[PDB]
Structures are given as structure tokens and as C-alpha cells.
Design an enzyme around this catalytic site. Structure first.
Site, PDB file in Angstrom:
ATOM      1  N   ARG A 191      -9.431   7.766 -82.109  1.00  0.00           N
ATOM      2  CA  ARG A 191     -10.849   7.590 -81.818  1.00  0.00           C
ATOM      3  C   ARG A 191     -11.073   6.138 -81.375  1.00  0.00           C
ATOM      4  O   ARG A 191     -10.802   5.219 -82.147  1.00  0.00           O
ATOM      5  CB  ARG A 191     -11.682   7.881 -83.053  1.00  0.00           C
ATOM      6  CG  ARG A 191     -13.184   7.499 -82.930  1.00  0.00           C
ATOM      7  CD  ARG A 191     -13.919   7.928 -84.188  1.00  0.00           C
ATOM      8  NE  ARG A 191     -15.356   7.631 -84.133  1.00  0.00           N
ATOM      9  CZ  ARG A 191     -15.966   6.750 -84.917  1.00  0.00           C
ATOM     10  NH1 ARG A 191     -15.235   5.966 -85.718  1.00  0.00           N
ATOM     11  NH2 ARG A 191     -17.288   6.652 -84.943  1.00  0.00           N
TER      12      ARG A 191
ATOM     13  N   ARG B 229     -29.005  -2.670 -84.125  1.00  0.00           N
ATOM     14  CA  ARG B 229     -28.171  -3.566 -84.911  1.00  0.00           C
ATOM     15  C   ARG B 229     -28.908  -4.870 -85.185  1.00  0.00           C
ATOM     16  O   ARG B 229     -29.776  -5.281 -84.412  1.00  0.00           O
ATOM     17  CB  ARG B 229     -26.838  -3.899 -84.222  1.00  0.00           C
ATOM     18  CG  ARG B 229     -25.958  -2.700 -83.917  1.00  0.00           C
ATOM     19  CD  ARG B 229     -24.497  -3.050 -83.930  1.00  0.00           C
ATOM     20  NE  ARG B 229     -23.722  -1.818 -84.027  1.00  0.00           N
ATOM     21  CZ  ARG B 229     -22.887  -1.530 -85.012  1.00  0.00           C
ATOM     22  NH1 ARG B 229     -22.657  -2.452 -85.942  1.00  0.00           N
ATOM     23  NH2 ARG B 229     -22.298  -0.326 -85.099  1.00  0.00           N
TER      24      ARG B 229
ATOM     25  N   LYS C  38     -22.305  14.440 -81.699  1.00  0.00           N
ATOM     26  CA  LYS C  38     -22.390  13.950 -83.072  1.00  0.00           C
ATOM     27  C   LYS C  38     -23.776  14.283 -83.619  1.00  0.00           C
ATOM     28  O   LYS C  38     -24.788  13.919 -83.009  1.00  0.00           O
ATOM     29  CB  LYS C  38     -22.117  12.441 -83.147  1.00  0.00           C
ATOM     30  CG  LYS C  38     -20.737  12.088 -82.598  1.00  0.00           C
ATOM     31  CD  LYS C  38     -20.567  10.565 -82.356  1.00  0.00           C
ATOM     32  CE  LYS C  38     -20.738   9.770 -83.619  1.00  0.00           C
ATOM     33  NZ  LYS C  38     -20.755   8.248 -83.330  1.00  0.00           N
TER      34      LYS C  38
ATOM     35  N   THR D 278     -16.732  10.444 -91.955  1.00  0.00           N
ATOM     36  CA  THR D 278     -17.365   9.258 -92.530  1.00  0.00           C
ATOM     37  C   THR D 278     -17.327   9.184 -94.047  1.00  0.00           C
ATOM     38  O   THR D 278     -17.889  10.025 -94.732  1.00  0.00           O
ATOM     39  CB  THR D 278     -18.808   9.106 -92.024  1.00  0.00           C
ATOM     40  OG1 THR D 278     -18.766   8.909 -90.609  1.00  0.00           O
ATOM     41  CG2 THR D 278     -19.459   7.843 -92.631  1.00  0.00           C
TER      42      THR D 278
HETATM   43  K   LIG Z   1     -20.081   4.944 -81.994  1.00  0.00           K
HETATM   44 MG   LIG Z   2     -23.427   7.301 -86.483  1.00  0.00          MG
END
Ligand SMILES: [K+]
Ligand SMILES: [Mg+2]
Ligand SMILES: [K+]
Ligand SMILES: [K+]
Ligand SMILES: [K+]
Ligand SMILES: [Mg+2]
Ligand SMILES: [Mg+2]
Ligand SMILES: [Mg+2]
Lengths: 495, 495, 495, 495
Positions: free
Chosen positions: B57, B99, B245, B303
Site C-alpha cells: 500500500r 490536517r 474506502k 486500521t
Molecule cells: K490516504
Molecule cells: Mg481514513
């Protein structure tokens, strides 16, 4: 050999997206909280009660009788402020633990590939080169090549060496290591009593006089260890429940016989993972839960459930699934150790544990669960068990909001709990021991009553309490069991 | 609405007590490893291959095209040293991330109850009083009372305030917070493109020319987002698989339509837990896995699976059950993020992940699993799907050691994988895209072949390779499928 | 001990109200017809073929070798007029039968409560006072109180008496009784050989030279009786199938061992009902069918299925349910005795039998049937059985119109038939014995082929025959099995 | 559309070989016997009670009110000799029947292919050339090509012809035909009232004053016909149960709506087989039983169950399976018509019917039966139904010997009977109507009681009666239900 299955779930978009709207203490899964300096105040103990704490665990691996008695006193004051949230009191024995000695500077930084020797003399004050071990017969028990784990396996040491007075090991990884940490000697016969003198005196001079309800006995290896604990408790301790902790190979091999003698089981995952490799622990957990469920014996799932919340205000994704899956596996209780005893977020940990429990309990298909339990149990069964099973099936068939159980000894309530109802089991008892001991069974909440005379009105009183606790409302049905040979269905009406 | 069920397990004392004896790469569950400085060397990448890494990944949330291209080059060298372990290459898009800016001293210690204001100007160098946010329209998106989470929720801030240029918040917990950390704005409409210009250029100027096999698209919200990605890939990218996702409320609400357009799904549990509360994430995981399983669409569980192994050589008890339960739930892949990209034990994390997978795969009752899948799928089905299903049932009925699938496009192998055989699916293909893309499906291992001419001998060649890889031995049966309209059973004999 | 279950039915208003629209010979249940003077002509035998007759039963309880050889010749002429409807030829042995002698006026009217004596001398010409019995040792076998049944129990006699030369009985009911009627002696040890000299000569001098395919052996009592029949058949008779008739207590007690040695079973309900009481016969029928089904051994349900149609053009309501229930129970064949051998409506009886079969076959849920068979069989199974089972499951999953089986010995076809497909099994064989013997298995129709060379085209030829017989059409799928290790699915297209 | 399933059976060698040892009246399946000259004497009626007769059927197709009233008087005398065997009284209406006239010589021999004309004038005294028909509008209802069936289809006639005054037909088979035989006109609209004037006067002037408990209404076609019967019964007949007879196409098409209005159903197989073809009747039987079972509506299976026993002392093999299969299908009652009304063996027919019922009831797996019923019923259900279902499950789980039901209206007993317990349901009621009407439900036996006051002792009285009837013994458990909201389990002890 061991069929093990989680309950089927019906998961809806509504449940994923809509926030929970029930009191945390309406949950069926019960929570054992380990007490320690992080929850020492009466105020914090009251907050843990409100967050979902059901049983208080006193870990006699640490502290003196005076330390635990002071804690016990603050728990009794917290109980007085929540007199209807009857907590069970659990003593967790030290057992045949092995621990490192103290350190010249309280902490040491072992480096990978560096040598480390351990010595049989426990008064040595060690450092990075040298540390003491509380097991005097360490040199004679390890042979070269065995692995020694310290501080919950935060470092491992390969036994390169052994002599009459000491062992030499190579550090297999670098780690900071504190004072008085536990040590595991996997695949080595340790020559320590399963029930030590200290254990017998904690049981006899603390748990009996203080009124503890459960003994969680560490490192149990055989049905004979349980029988010895029952014999030490004797007539004065006859109402104290024995909960063996399964945390080594012998306890796995002899699990069926241990279970038959036991009042319930604790899955002690920390030590179990160090005695069998960690990748195996989930097999042991799901199999013990399945066997305990089939026998009607309550089981506690323990250790590192929400571990990161010792330091963080929210758990990891793996910690969330661990609590939910332990519920879906069939556990009666889940447990917190350092998350409540010494962490920075004890109320938050108990709070989120309760919230995960509520989500896992709510998604279960209780029709399939009930059928799978009855499919797996041989018939004929006793009259008592068959009536208890019918209380559950009836409650599910009409969506009753509770099952009321009149029970002297708790036996009726335990049998109902074995069939895992969607609704709460309200157990009424005149025994103080019964109303606290039943806390280890899923879904059972107890009320102390004066008597069972006029069963009609005792039931009508319990119905009144249930409406006052918002467990039932006008239009609901409730199931009542007593005798264990009678079941009644009552609709709640306006009066 | 969403029936979800784990596979039934038959757990034996032998499996709990006897150590695993198979090659880690014989596992059926596949592993996605996130690359980063902790596995940058060719030597470490080769060790991750041997430990069970199947897909690499590349997280385009960080780094430049030159950084990822250098990584890609070391992966190609590692591939040359393990030429028969064909790795899939996955590009994970940045998407509409938010962020924090940088810090005057690189780190800050926020204190609970202290004020913290965030500003729209991203070049501000902040401190404990003040920090920058990359989302210019933060003041207009939050209203007072909303919660702002920073650094995977390690700290949360309640929006007390908002103006044209900034927001004022009260720190709800104390935490040390580093540079460039992610921020979540739960239950707030963020005005950022789902597929940004940077995303389109990472897909078009890196994933297409470099030969990536999967695009894992962040924060997907609708079937239209998937259709846009397919259109950007265009004819040159037609063989690149799109993996949305699922990590926000919109992706949950529209999951069925997203899934229909998708080539597979990633359960992005980190962000999902911050967008819906953490206690809900296990519901979302089990429901997506169940739906993906029923559709034959591969799913990656992602995760914090083994998070503590960023710092510790062994995982917690909750981390072990999280990997095993994701397998028992039905996931095709499990994923590592910081455990491989930046932690201190990357080879150990992949190693123990593989070992847990092997234990979970081994305890499954594959008879019941197969019946429960066929019970849940409407018939008539296509000829292709019915033959693939019969390859699985036949293999289970005779305890075949493998299913060989001749497949141009991979379609036959995907259909066999949908029925979750106990044995490996050996897919043979002449397409380079097919042999790498199939890595996202459980149990499929591919071999590049020159051709399918003389199917008798191509099968006999594949049988020879399987014995050379110790996947089968004299006395075993193997199943072969091709056409998708023919199934043959071959016994391996001495010749 | 003996779980027995009918197949679940899905019964629609359409099926109840809409008339059948398929050829009678498309049915899966096969019909054994007993030949006799009512169907002696070639023309009537051809009509029975068209009505659904699959096996011709020659009852050697009556007639001479010349009588049966003349019948056999008319059957061969009828076969020449329907050369593709390959009939099986079954010889039904006399066995240890007991019969009354002849009568002064050919018939007698016994009156209830009247006395009746029977004598050991078989040449006595009896009347209402007196009748002969073919069992010389009758006086020594009966003790007072035993019941003697004559003419299929149309009259019963209580043994009041016994001497060296005769027995005295009281008639328990009035009845007209004809010549040469059978007699049952329930719960009495009869001293007659199970396989008599006459039986051995019918098997050796008729069934072997004439080419019969089955021996239906009367009153079989042990596995040793079957082994003796196989030994008498010897190498020249190795292809003749042995079908024990279960019609007494010993055959019930030893059924499992009899079945293991047998090629199939006949449920001989007439005698069975007289040896065990009539109310028990349905228990014996359903249990034998269940056991035969589980073993893959074909079973024939016999006797009084459509009895009233010996005299009436339509059956009773109980006769209809008897045929349908025998199908739903799982029988391979149903049988007619006097309805075809001597009744007034032989073509009508075979016709309505076929029509009931078609209705019962059409209402079955073949998904549940298949799952219940696989649920009840231990695995691993042989490669051959697993491929045959997958041909059935595949055919049901895509609604294939047939399964083509290339089979030398018939073994592949028998294994497919064990899993009871909804569609016809078209067995191709080069063996004359195989194409006729397979008629005892449900759903199997055979074609004699020259060879299996070029399996592709032999299958394409069989597909052509199937379209010519309206068993399949453009758009249908067909399953083909050969090897038993290969299964192919072929769609029929326009060419 | 209509899932229909027989109960699974566990059939043991012991049950096949060991004779029945229980009283015939301990059976659960109830028997309706048609009264007629063969059972006209009080002595024979008492023998039918002892053999298992539960409901007496008065067939108003024949005879006058004085004929039936005399019969009714002999039944009341027989009832006085068996005062605790409370019989239900059923009036079966003539309905829109069609019958042939009388004959010059009382019988006629029609020959196949011969002509036969029928005339609208009912006073014509016919012969082989000519016969009268009671349906005046026969010429206008038949068109050429329709088939006319006479005497339960013993002969059929094709309508070659029609005029204003008559019809010409060709005899399709030879037959001897008696006086006043029924005629069917399949697939022809007959212009006769469903409820005729004669029917209304039989219901109002006989069934109401005489105290009949059921009206079995012939040829019912719609829910409106049932509503009309309920309205004619009015308040005085409110306790008389309406049982529509399903015997034509309209009754099949509208069965669901007919059932909803009905108190139960009779499967009238004789006429049904002539209106739909005979091969379809088993489909209709199994589907109606399944639907009635799911609704809790009692069903009677009727006609030709043991037909040959009108002439023979033992039934055929198909007749045995017909009774057993009707039990295994789920029928509440089975019925005898000419076997009791006019045959030569009325006591024997009722006796063997009871014995077959007992064998079929004994082989059932009641665990699977109960689970399959609960699996097929939507929940939530009413409190009453859920308690009744739990009485059954509890009784099966402990192998209780009976369920005692205190019931005013019978509703509680009907709900218990819906769940088909292995044990007898002892219903206690103060209503005379209730204790007789409940006879149509399987397994219910009633006792008239004075009152329900002191439920403890009324139950203890019923327990005493049950031991006196050998339904229970010391060591047995019994279940008691009353309220419908209370269930108690009582063990019978020595006192
Ligand atoms: K990402
Ligand atoms: Mg995420
Ligand atoms: K401890
Ligand atoms: K014979
Ligand atoms: K009638
Ligand atoms: Mg421990
Ligand atoms: Mg016989
Ligand atoms: Mg009728």
C-alpha cells in the site's frame, strides 16, 4: 470436538447511525472493575457505578490487607450513595506468581542482544546487567533455550545458561522495565503451590470476614485445586463462589473437570497468552465461553480489553471489536484491569465499555440464539430448567420487557440467564449473598426483598419497582417465575 | 435488514496446544502492508514478503511522487528476489483530508480546559495557544458545540466559537500533539472535493504509468464518485481495480450503491470511528463484510489491527482477537498501517498477523460456511457461478488440497473465492494484470502461464508446481476448473 | 434409531388446477408391471410401455416355464415396436410359499364360527368343511391359538387344535374363497427352504438363459440367503441384480445386513402385512426407503397400490395418496400386481400411476431434498460420489434439463440417482446388461451406444437425441459426467 | 407458494415388531364416524365409542328428520352408557347434490360404447337405455364433450349431445349401477343454491334444537357462503361450529378466504377427486392440512380411508398408508363413511383406524414438529398463544404425560392443540358446548367441571381423574394452564 459460535447479528443502518438512548446500567453484560489508586475516592467509585460497574475486583497480587480494607471501606461508602446498585465483591488471589526484584534506579533499559543474568537472591538491587527474581528455584526449573518473559512480555530473554545460583540470558529486544514486574516461564514446571499460605490467609482472614462474594483463584490447574478452595472456605464460606482463573496449559487440559467443580470461570488472557502463544488465545476464549454457556456457568473475559485507554481517552479499533466480540461470543462479564486501577481515564473506560456492550447486545438475533442453545442441550431436562427456558422463549415471543424471578438461592435466576433473554432478569431474593453473587451472570439485576409471602403482591411490587426504574411501561408484558415450577404473564395497565 | 454472522468454529485442544507447522504464505487471508521508512530497504521488504505480505500500500496522504517512486523501485527489486510471490500494488489516495499545520517546537502539550484557537491561514507556525488547519473554510463549516478531533482523536476540542477568520475551542483532554496530524469534523459538511486535483494526478501520473493494480479511494460518498474514478482511469486504466474506502456517514448510507459500482471495499476504521462513534464501528465492519461476501466483492479490513506493535514486540489480547474475528467475520484481507510503515517491529507484526490468520482459518467449519453461503444466494445462478460453487463443495467433500483455476480475466477465480474453500485456489493466467489483481481475494494465489493450450498438460504442469510448493502430495486430490464450464478431479499418484 | 422423512413439497394452486402436459414416460419414478393374461397380447404390452411400464415382472409363483417363455416372447415383440424404451426383465421367485389345495366346486363359502379342518394330504379335493394345504408339516408347526390367514387375509382361522395328520380351526369371518390361494402362518417357524429346488431351477434354467436382469427373491431372511443366490448365479449370472423381498419378521430384523449384500430391495407389503400386523406396514416401508436412499440402493414399493382398479376404472382416494406418498417417501419404483396381470383396466392403472408419479415428483422442493441427503451422509466420500453429487447440485442450481452420464457399469448413474435430481439422468452405455439393469433406479433412462470415443461428440450426439426426445431445447443447460471424475456444463444453442 | 411437509418420523425396530399396548381411546387423532343402518343399535354404537369414535356424523344427503332423530336417540342412549366419552354431533348437509332417479329393476348394467340418455323428468323409472337426473337444468348446463360421472365415478359418460329436454351420452365403461347414486359434472357451472331451502331447514329445525355441535356444509364456494350459514344460525346457534367441505374448484380457489371465516375444514376427497382429477387430490389434501395447521384451524380428512373394509375384515396396504399419512401430514381428524354407515365390519374399521393412528402418532419426532411450527409463525404473537406454545415445549422437554387446560370457551385448548403436543390435552370446562366442540381438535379430551374456583384443587382434582384414567402415574409431570396467562408444572407424588 469444541463447536463454538457467535450469536447471529441483525445489523441495521438505524443502529449504526442513531445514538444510544438507554441508561448505561440497563445493559445485560456485567463489568468487573479492578480497584486501585486511580479510582480510590468515593466520588470516583460512584462515577464507576453510574458508568456500569457491577463487581469490584480486589487484586491481592498487590497491596496489604490494610490497603484493601481501606479500599473496601470507600466502596461501602460508594455503595451507600447507590444503595440499589448492589455490587459484588471479588477477591483475586496472588497465586504462584513470579516477579522481578527492585532496581537500583527503579527502571532499567535492557538492550537487544545484551546479556542479562537473574539471581535467586531476592534482596539484590538490580540494574541493566542484573535483576532479582522471586522464584528461588529458577535455576533448577529452566534449561538452556527456554524463553523468559518479563512485564507482560514487554521483553523476552532466551535462557542461554543455568547454574546452581543464577541464570544467564540474552535480551531478545530492547525495553524500559520497571519495578516488581511479573515473569512467565512458558513450558516449564514451576515448583510453587497453587494455593499458597498467603492465598489461604487472604481467603480466610479477608474474604470471609469482609464478606467477599467471589474468589478468583489464580493459575488453577485441576479440579482438586477447586475442591481444596471449597474445603478451606468451609461452612462459614459456603456462600462464596469459586471462580478459577484459566491462564496456563494445565488449566486448559483439565478445563472440563475444573469447570464441573467451579461456580464460573475467568478467562485470564494476559498470562494465558504468555503460557500458550498469543495467537492461540482467541481459540481458548471462544471454546471456554461456549462450554460455559452450555453448562450454565458464568464466565468473565479478562485483560487488555480497552488497554490503550490507560493513556488515551478513546480505545483503538481492535479494542472496540474485542469487547463487542466477547459479548457476541457469549461472555457474561467483561473486565478492566489497569484501565480502572491505575489509568488516566477510568470513568471513560467503563463508560465506553458499557456503550459497546449495549450495541453488541442490541444487534443479536435472540430467536436464533435461543434455538441454538436448546438445539445443543440434551433433553429431558429438569422441571426447573424447562420452566426457566420457557420464561425466556415466552418473553421473546411477545417482546416482554422483563422476566421477574423469585429466588431464594439464585438457582432460578441462573437457569434463566443460561438461556440469554433479550430482556433484563429481575431477581428478587431475601438473601444478601444471593443478590450480590448473581452479578456474575449476564442480564441478572437483583432486589433484596423482605419475603415472598403473597406472591401476587410481591410480583406487583416488583412490577412497581420496574416501572419506577423505567424498565417497563404501560402496555408492556412481563414474565414472572417462582416455585421453579410456575410462570405467569402480566400485562402492565393503567390503574 | 442486515443479517451478519461469523463462521462457526470447531476448536480442539490439539489446535490450542500444538504449534503451527505450515509456511506462513500458505494462509488464505491476504495482508496489505503500508510501506514507509520502517520497511524502506530491499532486505526488509523481502522479509515482509516471507512473513505474508501480499499487497503493498502506497499512502499518498504523505510524500511526493519521487518518494513513492523510490519505494516502488525497492519493491520491484524485492519482487525480483521473490519472483513467484506476485505482489499487488495499491495506491491509497489522500482524498479530502484535513490536517493541522506545523508547530513552533514541532510538538505541543495541550492542557484540558485550556483554550485553543485554530486559524484558516496555513502558514502560521503554531504552539499550545494556536495551531493552523489546512481547511480554509473551517470557520464557516463548524457551528458552536461541534467537536473537533485531532491526531486520530488523541485530543478532542469543543467548538465554543466561530468567526470569519478562526475558531475558538476548549481542549477537552491533555495530550502531546505532533506535526501535520489529521483532523475530523464529525457531523459537519466539509466543502472539499471527494476526488481532488492532487488525487486525479496521483491516479493518472503515478498509478497508471507505474502499473498499480488498485486505487483505494478515500472518503468515497456515492456511486457517482466511483463512476468518476473509472472514467478518469479510462481505457488505459481499465485493468486497475477501484476500492472505495468507507469512512464517513455518507459512505455508510450509500454503501449498497457504492458496492455495486466497486471492485471491492476497504473498511477504513480509523476515520469511520471518528465520523460515527467508536462503539459503532464493529457494526459497520460486520455488515460490510457480510454484504461484500454475499456479492462476491473482496473486502479489506483496515486500521489499528496490531497497533501496539508499533512499539511492542507482541500484540495485546484485543489485537489478537481483532485479527482472528475479522477472519471469522469473512474478510478477504487484513491491513497494517503504522505497524509496517513506521513502527519498530514490522516483520514481527506481519509474522504474527499471518499466524493469527492461520489459526482462525484452521478452526472454521467449512461445511457449515459453504451451506450458509448457498442458503443466502438466490438461484438460478449463472452457469459460471454454479460450476465454481461445485468446485468448492467437491473439494470440501473429498478434502482436496487445492482448486486449480484456469482464468484469463480472473472471473473464475473470483467466483470460486466467493464460496470460501478450505483449500488454496491456484489461479493460472496469461495476463499480468490478472495475476496481481487477484491478490485482494481470499485464498487465491496466482501463477503466470504462457498459455492454456493442451489443458491436460497445463493442469499437469500446475499440479507439478503445486507439489514443488508442498501444496499437494501423492495421494491428494485436486480440483481443476476451466472453460467456467468444466470441473475435473485428479488424484496425484506416483509416476 | 431410524430417522425417516418425506421430501418437503411446494404445492401451488396452479399445479392443483392445471392439467399435466408432459409425456408419461418423462416421469422419474419407474413402474414394475406384473405380466399375466390381462396383458398377454403384444398390442396391450405396447400400450403398457406407452403408459409408463419400465420393468416386466414374471411371477414364478404361478405358471410353467413354457407359460413364462411365451409371455417373454410377446414382450420381446413389444420391445421391437418400442426399441428405445429398454425394459428390464424381473423374475420373482416362488420361494417358501404355502397354498391351499383345490376345491370340489372351485369355490367355497366359509361361515363365521363354523369349523374348518385342513389336511396335510395335498391331493384332497376340499369343500366348506375341509381344505388341503401344500405345507406337509403344518400340524407340527402350529400350536393352538395361532391364526391362519388365507387369500391375502380375506379369511382368518384360529388354530383350536392340532394332531399328527391335520389341524382344526374355527372360521373367524365369512368369505368366498377360491382355488390355490396363499396362506400365512404369522409368528410360526415354517420349515421350508428359503431358496427351494424349484427356485434354483427357475433362476438357472430360465432367468440366466432368457436374459432376466433382476431376481426378486421371496421371503429372504438373512444376508446368507443373498450370498447363496449370488453364488448360484455364478460367473454366468454375474450381471443379474439380486433384489430381496422383505416380507417377514426375519427380513425386518436382519434388514441392514440383507441390504448390504443386496443390489436393491422390494417392499413386499402383502405378505409383510400378514406377518407383522397391517398397521405396522407403513413404518416398515418408510424406514426401508430411508435406509435404501441413504445407501444408494434402489427400492421397489409393492402391492395393493391401485388394487381397486382390478375392477374399477378409477382408484380410491387412499390408493392415490399411496402412490404419491411412496414417491414422496423416496421410492425408486412402484409396482402393480393384479392391476396389470389379471384386472379389467391394466392400461388405465399404469396410466394413472404415471400421472400420480408426475404430480408427486413436480411438487418436491429439490433444494431441500438435496441438502437433507448431503446432511445425512458422512464425508469424506469417494471422488466418484462427490462428482455425482455435484452434477445434481449444479443441475438444480441452473435448472438444467438433464444430466448425461457416460457409464460402462452403471456405477456413475447409480451415484447420480442417489442424489435424486429434479431432471432426468440420461445414462449412455455400451453394455446391454447396464442399460436394462439401471431401470430400477429413479430418474435413469438409458441409451445403448457403440462407444465413448470422442467424448465431445458422444456428448453432442446424446444432446441431439435429447432434443429429438423433447427432453431439452435451445436455451437449456445440460450437465455431462464421465471419467467419474469430470463434469461439464453445456448450453444448447441454435446451430 | 404452499410449503407442505409431513412430520419427521423416528422409526425403530421395536415399534415395528412390538404390539401396541395402550387403550385405543388414548390416541390423539380423533375419528368421525358416519352413522347408518350398520351401526344403528345402541350396542354397536357403544362398541364404536370403545374402538375410538369421537364425533358422530349425520349425513343429511339421505333419510328424513325422523330417521336421523331416531339415530340421535340411540346415540344419546349409547352416550349414557359411556358418560365420560363426550361425543360431538355433526350434521353434514346435502347441499347442491345431483342424483340419478330410480330404476325399473333397481339396478342396471351399462355396457361400454352403448348409448345412454338422461332426462330432466325425475319421475321416470329408468333402465339400461334411460335414467332420470335430479338436476332439472342438466340440458342447459352441459355442452357436447363434457364428462358425466355416476356413482362415485364407477361409470363415466361423455356428453355427445344436448337438447331442451334431455342429454345423450355414450357409456365409457361397463358397470352395474344402483338406485339414487350421485352424479358429478366436472368443469360445468351447476345452477343450484349452495345452501338450499332443505339445508336451511336441516340446520334450523334439526341441528339447533337437537344440539348438534358442527355443521359440515357441502360444496362451499366462498367466504360469503360461510357468513350466510353463521347468520342463519344466529344467536341461538352461535355455539355451533361451521366446517366447510372443500370438494370443488371454487372451494380450492377461494380456500384462504373460506378458511378465515371457518371454524375448521373437511377435506371432502370423494367429490374433490371427481371435480379435479383424482391424481391431484393428494396435493389439495396436503396443502389444506398445512394451511389449517398454520392457522390453528382443525381439519378432517375424509372419504375412502378404509373403503375396502366395507366388505373385507382387513384393509388394503394403500388404505393403511392413507390413514397414517393423513396423521403424519397433520390432520386433526380422520373419517369413515360407508365403512361405519353400511359396511359389514364397522367396529373392525374403527378399531384398525385407531391402531394406525397410534402407530403414526408414536413415530413422530415432536421436537422437530414443534420447532417447524414455531419457525413458520410470525412473532410477536398474543400472550395467550405464547403461553400455550410454552406449555407444549415444556411438556416435551420434560416428557410430561399431560397438559391440563382450564378453559371456558375452549380457546386455550385450541391454541395448545395448534402446537401438536406429544401428550394428551385434558381440557376442563363448565360449558356443555365447549366440551363437545373441542373434539374436532387433535389431542384434546374434555371433562365437564362445575367451576374453576380454587384453581389449586380443580387442578388437583383433574390430576386425580387423570391417574384414574391411567393417563398419568406417580413420578410423572403434568403441565397446567389457565388465566391463558399462567403455566404450572406439577410432579405427581405418592400421598
Ligand atoms: K490516504
Ligand atoms: Mg481514513
Ligand atoms: K492476582
Ligand atoms: K412370487
Ligand atoms: K352430505
Ligand atoms: Mg494472571
Ligand atoms: Mg409375498
Ligand atoms: Mg361430497
Amino acid at each position: 470436538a469444541g463447536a463454538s459460535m457467535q450469536s447471529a447479528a441483525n445489523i441495521t443502518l438505524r443502529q449504526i447511525l442513531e445514538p444510544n438512548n438507554v441508561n448505561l446500567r440497563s445493559k445485560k453484560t456485567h463489568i468487573v472493575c479492578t480497584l486501585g489508586p486511580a479510582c480510590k475516592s468515593v466520588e470516583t467509585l460512584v462515577k464507576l457505578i453510574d458508568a456500569g460497574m457491577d463487581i469490584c475486583r480486589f487484586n491481592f497480587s498487590h497491596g496489604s490487607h490494610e490497603d484493601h480494607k481501606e479500599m473496601f471501606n470507600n466502596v461501602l461508602k460508594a455503595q451507600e450513595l447507590r444503595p440499589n446498585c448492589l455490587l459484588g465483591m471479588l477477591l483475586d488471589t496472588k497465586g504462584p506468581e513470579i516477579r522481578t526484584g527492585f532496581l537500583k534506579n527503579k527502571e532499567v533499559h535492557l538492550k537487544e542482544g545484551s546479556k542479562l543474568k537473574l539471581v535467586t537472591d531476592y534482596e539484590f538491587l538490580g540494574d541493566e546487567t542484573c535483576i532479582a527474581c522471586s522464584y528461588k528455584k529458577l535455576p533448577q526449573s529452566v534449561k538452556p533455550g527456554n524463553i523468559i518473559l518479563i512485564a507482560d512480555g514487554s521483553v523476552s530473554c532466551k535462557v542461554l545458561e543455568t547454574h546452581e545460583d543464577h541464570v544467564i540470558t540474552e535480551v531478545l529486544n530492547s525495553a524500559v522495565i520497571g519495578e516488581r514486574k511479573n515473569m512467565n516461564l512458558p513450558n516449564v514446571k514451576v515448583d510453587l503451590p497453587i494455593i499458597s499460605e498467603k492465598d489461604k490467609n487472604d481467603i480466610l482472614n479477608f474474604a470471609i470476614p469482609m464478606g467477599c462474594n467471589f474468589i478468583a483463584a489464580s493459575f488453577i490447574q485441576s479440579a482438586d485445586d477447586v475442591r481444596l478452595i471449597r474445603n478451606l472456605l468451609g461452612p462459614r464460606g459456603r456462600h462464596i463462589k469459586i471462580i478459577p482463573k484459566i491462564e496456563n496449559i494445565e488449566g486448559i487440559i483439565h478445563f472440563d473437570k475444573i469447570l464441573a467443580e467451579s461456580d464460573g470461570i475467568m478467562i485470564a488472557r494476559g498470562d494465558l497468552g504468555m503460557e500458550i502463544s498469543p495467537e492461540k488465545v482467541f481459540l481458548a476464549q471462544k471454546l471456554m465461553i461456549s462450554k460455559c454457556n452450555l453448562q450454565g456457568k458464568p464466565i468473565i473475559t479478562a485483560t487488555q480489553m480497552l488497554e490503550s485507554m490507560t493513556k488515551n481517552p478513546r480505545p483503538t479499533r481492535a479494542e472496540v471489536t474485542d469487547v463487542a466480540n466477547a459479548v457476541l461470543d457469549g461472555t457474561d462479564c467483561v473486565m478492566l484491569s489497569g484501565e480502572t486501577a491505575g489509568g488516566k481515564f477510568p470513568v471513560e473506560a467503563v463508560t465506553i465499555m458499557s456503550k459497546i456492550c449495549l450495541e453488541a447486545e442490541a444487534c443479536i438475533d435472540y430467536k436464533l440464539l435461543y434455538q441454538s442453545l436448546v438445539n445443543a442441550i440434551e433433553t429431558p431436562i429438569s422441571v426447573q430448567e424447562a420452566v426457566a427456558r420457557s420464561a425466556v422463549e415466552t418473553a421473546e415471543s411477545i417482546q416482554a420487557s422483563l422476566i421477574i424471578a423469585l429466588t431464594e438461592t439464585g438457582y432460578t435466576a441462573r437457569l434463566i440467564a443460561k438461556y440469554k433473554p433479550s430482556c433484563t432478569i429481575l431477581a428478587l431474593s431475601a438473601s444478601d449473598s444471593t443478590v450480590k453473587c448473581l452479578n456474575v451472570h449476564r442480564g441478572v439485576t437483583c432486589i433484596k426483598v423482605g419475603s415472598f409471602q403473597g406472591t401476587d403482591i410481591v410480583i406487583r411490587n416488583a412490577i412497581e419497582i420496574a416501572k419506577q426504574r423505567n424498565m417497563a411501561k404501560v402496555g408492556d408484558s412481563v414474565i414472572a417465575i417462582h416455585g421453579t415450577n410456575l410462570m405467569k404473564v402480566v400485562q402492565i395497565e393503567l390503574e
